[PDB]
Design a protein around this ligand. Structure first.
Ligand SMILES: OC[C@H]1NC[C@H](O)[C@@H](O)[C@@H]1O
Length: 928
């Protein structure tokens, strides 16, 4: 690898970060500090759910002002939006330095990239009160939400249920760096050119950062702003025991050997933060694509947060600042975590419906070295009864790092390789990165250049820099023409050697530039639209994944199907485009433990299709670590093993016994649960529901769960997992969230009942700690197969998990896994309800059976049954009854049931075999 010893800006080395931190330091120590920003009330108007006014910023002691247009929107969802722009820049009345052609306006296209819905203004929103000092707007459901806008100094307080929850500018940290010329006196050391990492940023606009304090009143825990190697409940950043000293950073970057427990940026950024306490949740989304830092402190509400004489109630103070663009913030008032995330997903998108196969196990390393290597691994997995769906090719498959080629010495017959995988319904994934080799006899680069599709430098020249191919240029995927060109390259008849089972991995899309500052592009590079790279950096990865997503919709005439694209770099909205992973982690126990809070943070930030490299990327995991890593990785929504080029081969059949058997058992569990995993992805698609769910989300009334980040619920199943992530551990302490009954998934032992507590569970190497909560039904497929495709027509088992209510609910969603026919109703979605000794299956959306004409997939599913029902926590009244009564599609019959009484701590349970009811039809089964 090119960079041996990396240089990352600390906050003091980022000019605008230094300035905003210093602004805070001044404001928070000034006596009677007043923010020098005022609404000019006579400029204000409220109409049809929107307030518009001019904020005047006082810029010097002579009282000179600049005009900053304010827009506050009250949306039908109950979300509010606050936007501040700069009028002189809107009017183009500034002069860029260096004869730069960069845009004069503040970047205002983040919305175009990110926002897909939820923007309808609430015409029911109304001014409840105003005078010459303030105005209050009521909005939200039944007018329950209020925003009080104070004019002088400017502030906004967002209220519900008789209190303030979120305050803007309470601490007076609002900072919009207005345009100024470079003039000498008649601290500006960071205003103009800045050098770092072997590069000087020409900085043609000068200072232009935007920042604000956002206070979460009475909240002690905040969450989100992935991606960081950090706890789910974010740390403070201004010092203290256990805390950081630097703000959280979002500046998508290629961070070689990234460390644990750090606010340093990683590869992707979602500037979305929630605050949660018992029975109250709120949140903000900072819609800004530039380099962004977030400071976090917690204490009392007093100016000295450690003062005596004041109420103890904690407020979390957050200080957001971005290098350029608009101040543009959405405010969510909940009141539950589910509400907040659903509203966020309405704005930025829900999870795309995945390729079904992509929930399977993915086998990868850097590299499989030939087509024969690939075919041998495929055979070996089958010899060792280790199911898997996809094999991956990293960068060594290419001809000298030219994308859209194959190394013909080593990959002689890629179609034959593709066809072998197809015999088990398996897939191939091939890497394609955004750097295009600058060399002769390569039509891809010729077209990139002649069509003007490459990112440019500060002066309009084509950008050149180094990555895997050596000297390279970069696709500018902000350009719609570049995205349309890119589509053409993926057609099966153009990208030779690919076929219908070939999908794509996008990497190095931060962009990673080996000889660039912080391994990325200069900030004064120019993109399509004449935006500076500084304006759009955090969107770059997403634009590239977008290009590839749309290339995979159709690669031959008549084809229309779901993409699968893995990305490294990402932004808000990337959930619409495919999966991510957490990049170059390390083969050590601390990274295994860290993976779970990271993957959880992804899902609560609205991008749940996430995972970490199983085994760790860098290094050689011990056999026990690798084994535990499989047991955790089967709970990542995106489940792939991967290894760095210097790591030994560690395909799972190489581990040896007893590890092989334990790893195979983990794989078999993932596969058996695939019906429930796919259903969980369906809910993520319907309304942004996370796929794996932290305690704050499932149990908003249970304060003790707030920071817990090492256990989680799966989908809609009530399954509670706590993988072992510590070396040589042979037990685990699980926090039981509530008073329901919890059962061991494998033995049906009663682990807890009647009261929230910590329960200690045996957990040797061969144990996956997995509990079933009472009140839930979930589906699985018990028959083991070699791949998910080979399970498509197999019968289902339903597990009905009862607590003392003897009542439960769950669901199952199935479709063809590939097309967009789901949009026209071609799917099965069952709601299963157990109540009063009866299990029923109904269509989840209450559709009439002959409101939909059955396509080919639905017709084939007529042969697919629910065949087995297990009831855990079976009532004693059922003892000695040998049948249940089954009714379906007009027919009634008896099915045999076996009742097993409680024994020691093992629950009573009953099993119905050979139920024989088609999964697509209503049924009613009466027990007892
Ligand atoms: O392609 C080489 C290398 N690039 C960086 C990626 O994070 C890693 O997964 C990959 O193996």
């Amino acid at each position: 690898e090119f960079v041996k010893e990396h240089d990352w800006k600390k906050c003091d080395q980022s000019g605008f970060c230094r300035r905003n931190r210093a602004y805070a330091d001044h404001a928070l120590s000034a006596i009677s500090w007043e923010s020098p920003y005022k609404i000019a009330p006579e400029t204000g108007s409220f109409k049809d759910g929107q307030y518009q006014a001019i904020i005047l910023k006082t810029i010097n002691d002579h009282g000179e002002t600049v005009r900053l247009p304010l827009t506050v929107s009250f949306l039908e969802s109950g979300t509010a939006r606050v936007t501040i722009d700069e009028e002189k820049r809107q009017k183009g009345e500034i002069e860029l330095r260096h004869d730069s052609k960069a845009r004069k306006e503040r970047y205002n296209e983040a919305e175009q990239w990110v926002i897909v819905g939820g923007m309808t203004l609430d015409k029911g929103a109304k001014v409840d009160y105003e005078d010459k000092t303030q105005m209050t707007v009521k909005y939200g459901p039944s007018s329950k939400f209020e925003a009080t806008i104070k004019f002088a100094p400017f502030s906004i307080d967002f209220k519900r249920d008789g209190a303030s929850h979120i305050k803007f500018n309470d601490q007076g940290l609002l900072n919009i760096e207005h345009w100024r010329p470079k003039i000498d006196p008649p601290d500006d050391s960071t205003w103009w050119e800045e050098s770092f990492g072997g590069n000087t940023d020409s900085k043609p606009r000068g200072p232009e950062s935007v920042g604000l304090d956002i206070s979460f009143v009475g909240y002690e825990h905040v969450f989100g702003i992935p991606s960081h190697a950090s706890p789910l409940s974010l740390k403070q950043t201004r010092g203290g025991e256990g805390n950081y000293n630097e703000p959280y950073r979002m500046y998508n970057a290629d961070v070689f050997e990234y460390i644990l427990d750090s606010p340093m940026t990683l590869y992707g950024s979602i500037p979305f933060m929630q605050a949660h306490r018992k029975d109250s949740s709120v949140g903000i989304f900072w819609l800004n694509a530039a380099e962004t830092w977030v400071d976090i402190t917690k204490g009392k509400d007093s100016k000295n947060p450690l003062a005596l004489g004041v109420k103890s109630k904690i407020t979390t103070r957050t200080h957001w600042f971005s290098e350029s663009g608009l101040l543009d913030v959405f405010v969510f008032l909940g009141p539950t975590p589910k509400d907040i995330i659903s509203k966020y997903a309405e704005l930025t998108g829900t999870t795309a419906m995945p390729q079904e196969f992509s929930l399977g196990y993915h086998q990868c390393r850097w590299n499989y070295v030939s087509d024969e290597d690939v075919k041998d691994v495929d055979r070996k997995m089958d010899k060792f009864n280790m199911p898997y769906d996809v094999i991956w090719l990293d960068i060594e498959y290419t001809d000298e790092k030219k994308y859209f080629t194959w190394d013909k010495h080593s990959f002689k017959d890629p179609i034959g390789m593709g066809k072998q995988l197809e015999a088990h319904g398996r897939k191939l994934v091939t890497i394609i990165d955004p750097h295009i080799k600058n060399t002769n006899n390569y039509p891809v680069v010729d077209e990139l250049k002649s069509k003007d599709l490459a990112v440019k430098t500060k002066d309009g020249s084509i950008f050149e820099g180094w990555c895997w191919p050596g000297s390279s240029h970069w696709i500018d995927a902000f350009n719609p023409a570049a995205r349309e060109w890119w589509k053409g390259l993926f057609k099966y008849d153009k990208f030779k050697g690919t076929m219908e089972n070939t999908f794509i991995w996008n990497d190095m899309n931060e962009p990673s530039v080996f000889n660039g500052p912080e391994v990325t592009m200069p900030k004064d590079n120019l993109h399509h639209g004449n935006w500076e790279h500084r304006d759009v950096h955090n969107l770059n990865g997403m634009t590239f994944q977008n290009a590839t997503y749309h290339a995979l919709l159709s690669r031959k005439p008549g084809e229309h199907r779901r993409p699968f694209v893995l990305t490294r770099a990402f932004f808000a909205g990337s959930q619409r485009l495919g999966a991510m992973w957490t990049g170059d982690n390390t083969a050590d126990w601390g990274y295994l433990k860290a993976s779970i809070p990271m993957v959880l943070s992804q899902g609560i930030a609205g991008f749940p299709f996430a995972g970490a490299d199983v085994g760790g990327f860098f290094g050689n995991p011990d056999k026990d670590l690798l084994t535990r890593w499989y047991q955790t990785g089967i709970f990542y929504p995106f489940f792939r093993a991967h290894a760095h080029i210097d790591a030994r081969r560690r395909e799972p059949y190489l581990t040896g016994e007893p590890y092989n058997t334990i790893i195979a058992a983990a794989l078999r569990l993932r596969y058996s649960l695939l019906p429930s995993w796919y259903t969980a992805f369906r809910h993520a698609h319907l309304d942004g529901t996370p796929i794996i769910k932290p305690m704050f989300y499932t149990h908003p009334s249970e304060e003790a769960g707030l920071p817990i980040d090492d256990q989680f619920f799966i989908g809609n199943t009530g399954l509670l997992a706590k993988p072992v992530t510590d070396k040589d551990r042979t037990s685990v302490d699980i926090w039981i969230p509530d008073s329901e009954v919890y059962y061991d998934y494998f033995t049906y032992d009663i682990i807890s009942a009647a009261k929230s507590k910590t329960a200690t569970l045996d957990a040797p190497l061969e144990k996956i700690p997995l509990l079933m909560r009472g009140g839930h039904v979930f589906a699985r497929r018990d028959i083991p197969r070699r791949s998910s495709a080979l399970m498509k027509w197999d019968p289902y088992t339903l597990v009905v998990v009862l607590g003392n209510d003897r009542k439960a609910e769950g669901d199952l969603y199935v479709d063809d896994g590939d097309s967009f026919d789901y949009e026209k109703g071609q799917y099965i979605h069952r709601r299963f309800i157990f109540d009063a000794n009866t299990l029923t299956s109904a269509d989840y959306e209450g559709r009439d059976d002959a409101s939909i004409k059955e396509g080919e997939w639905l017709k084939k599913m007529r042969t697919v049954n629910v065949e087995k029902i297990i009831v855990v926590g079976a009532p004693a009244a059922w003892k000695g009854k040998k049948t249940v009564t089954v009714e379906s599609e007009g027919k009634t019959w008896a099915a045999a049931i076996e009742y097993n009484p409680a024994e020691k701590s093992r629950a009573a349970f009953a099993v119905v075999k050979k139920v024989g009811v088609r999964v697509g039809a209503d049924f009613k089964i009466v027990f007892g």
